[PDB]
Design a protein around this ligand. Sequence first.
Ligand code: NAG
Ligand code: NAG
Lengths: 4, 423, 419
Amino acid sequence: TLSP
Amino acid sequence: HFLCGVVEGFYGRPWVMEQRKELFRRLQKWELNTYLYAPKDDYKHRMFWREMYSVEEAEQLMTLISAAREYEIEFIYAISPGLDITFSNPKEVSTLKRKLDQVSQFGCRSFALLFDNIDHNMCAADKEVFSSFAHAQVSITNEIYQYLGEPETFLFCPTEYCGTFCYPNVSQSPYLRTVGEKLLPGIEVLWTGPKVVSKEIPVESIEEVSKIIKRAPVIWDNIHANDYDQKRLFLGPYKGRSTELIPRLKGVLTNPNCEFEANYVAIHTLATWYKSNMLYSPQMALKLALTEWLQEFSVTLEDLQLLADLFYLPYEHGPKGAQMLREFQWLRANSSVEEWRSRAAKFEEMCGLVMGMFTRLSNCANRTILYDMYSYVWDIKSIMSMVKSFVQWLGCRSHSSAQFQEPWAFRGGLAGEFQRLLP
Amino acid sequence: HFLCGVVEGFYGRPWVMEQRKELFRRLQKWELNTYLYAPKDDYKHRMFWREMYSVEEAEQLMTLISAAREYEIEFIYAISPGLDITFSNPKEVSTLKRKLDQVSQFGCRSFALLFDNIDHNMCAADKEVFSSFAHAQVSITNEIYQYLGEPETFLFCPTEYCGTFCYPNVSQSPYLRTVGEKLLPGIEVLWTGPKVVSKEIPVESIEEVSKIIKRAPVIWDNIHANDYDQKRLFLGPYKGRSTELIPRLKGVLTNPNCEFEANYVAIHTLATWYKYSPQMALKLALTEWLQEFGVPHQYSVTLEDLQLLADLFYLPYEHGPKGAQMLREFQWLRANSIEEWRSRAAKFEEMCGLVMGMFTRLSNCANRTILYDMYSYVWDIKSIMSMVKSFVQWLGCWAFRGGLAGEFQRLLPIDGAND
Ligand SMILES: *[C@@H]1O[C@H](CO)[C@@H](O)[C@H](O)[C@H]1NC(C)=O
Ligand SMILES: *[C@@H]1O[C@H](CO)[C@@H](O)[C@H](O)[C@H]1NC(C)=O
């Protein structure tokens, strides 16, 4: 999935 | 009033209006009722969430929301101020409302805030106005909920949005314990199952989450999402979800393959599963979806049978593909050179069928379908060619010593090289 | 005059018209002149090449060819019938003519017939009428040439179209000897070099090919072609082709990445070459590209990033400096698991950090077209470096990866013969  | 359909919520190239119209037609063709707009990489959905739509962008969004009503599919508009916003700043809140105001005048009634995938603590300013992280999100969600006059349907996706993402565990969480208690009951909660991509959602796991959430949650379902693996595509049936679940959920929204046309089996088999309990068999739903898909395309049902088996499900290959695997596994192990030759030939044929499925697929009528899937099928065809070739080499070796160069022999570039050095 | 430009000649989704016409802008801006239409999977170019365009497709094509002339780019329409054509049957050779004529009236003056990637055996009917496979393609090629008034540019791509594809070598090829002598004077031959993807195109080799075909060939160049591996993209400079080849050839047409926007270096550096240091040409190309990556305008990506991007997706036989480096650094660390290691682990995590950095900035650029074309590539590299960043720390203090293909792929010993 993701973060910055 | 039970929500079932698609969420466009992946990373990557989003769909275009012409795909989303073709999406709606299919949704009511098969009796689903909802669409959630949350494509992570439309700059205005998340990345630049304070920003108003341009004039050409307004025109587009209105034409879309129009077509949504023209097909009586409910259109939900999401936004994601997760990684950026100052919760305690009221100009920040204003811009958020200004943005949602803009979209309501496009024709839009249903709304959603997403707080998936962001850092677990706030700025120096925020540490004061709110006691905890979970406290800050609800404040604005509710402030917003009411502003819109508390609309028809309004979803909330939490930071802890699935079992593994709950700290320390799922029912012992201050985060989710706050949400259940301090979030308005007119607001829905999105949940993805025990994991982000869930092999299965047990009836038990929803009861457990429902009690800390103090509602029946709407599933954001990642069963067919392919955005996290370049080589991967998913054309298998909706599977690992009990029909027993419909009574306990406010809906399921499927987050599917980035490639739009690939999502035929994904959405159809979901359609039948919901038609079932508003039990159900995956092996047959697929049989229904595949024969009907075959209409749209030369290629046989047998070809699509093979095709979905090679690109089945995130924890499961399909019957014809699992077999092709164990077969090549046995063949490479037992390297005598009795029956071994018998099985090489049988495998080599099974390879030629992939080459077959690829050919008739390329010679097909429906060019949109070919393209969304081209690189996925070219890849499988080429590996099966090397694999046929390699078994060929292994047989023609009791009579040769010739040991096993164009670039497509060694593969995957730099990524592939790093990957091969991992245990 | 010498032909230099792009050929849209790859498998998969073909570029759209609004992309092609942007290509025409870029060709002109950079003083290039040619564009060969040969996209293998655009219906009515290859698969069913018999079917004339609709009332709608005529509108689109005529509009495009018009645009090619507006920017002083020679449009070459190409046709791949070799899949299932019967040579002798003139219902066919008429159909060839018939289709050609149709596009001629879209305002089109240059053509090519393509015979790459087809079987060496014809049907029984043609086995009678024609002597050899070579003799056969020639026959139809010339007739069509004359049928259109012996046009100014006319190209023929052979079946033995690179060093490796000739029986048994290039200088004594029956197929090539025939084309050489019996294919007409005014028609040009397409050639990819030693290999289908030539790492280098040596001068000695072009001499060798020219002798046995009695022309200087036009290079169909696959240096930057990526259609053939899902994970591969090539943003490295044009390389391996000496400027001394130029006098010895009639053209270079580059068959570049499937994703349109990704072909900026591929094309810029080819122009640069056409006028040479590949390291210097990348710098010129990167620096100019940087201006196409802005941040969006608001009412409420550094050069060093592009350099890293290029180095991670560089050329088919070569990783770029920063790619090569990180690979060596991680190789040494996996090996050595006094404390100098920690200090070079520390430097490696920062390197990885720049991969995530580059992905993040790329994610905010206003030019969404560019971002999308390259997305799944930049994503993959970022995901893997995060994990490599991580696993290096497993030393300090995804089992279905690739799906079925990836699983089969790990069982062939032949991979990992490039590490
Ligand atoms: C997290 O991961 C999924 C699968 O990659 C991605 O599509 C999704 O948008 C992200 N957020 C949620 C709630 O799934
Ligand atoms: C052969 O291979 C290249 C790269 O895979 C492909 O793009 C090209 O269309 C084919 N034909 C020729 C003449 O190269």
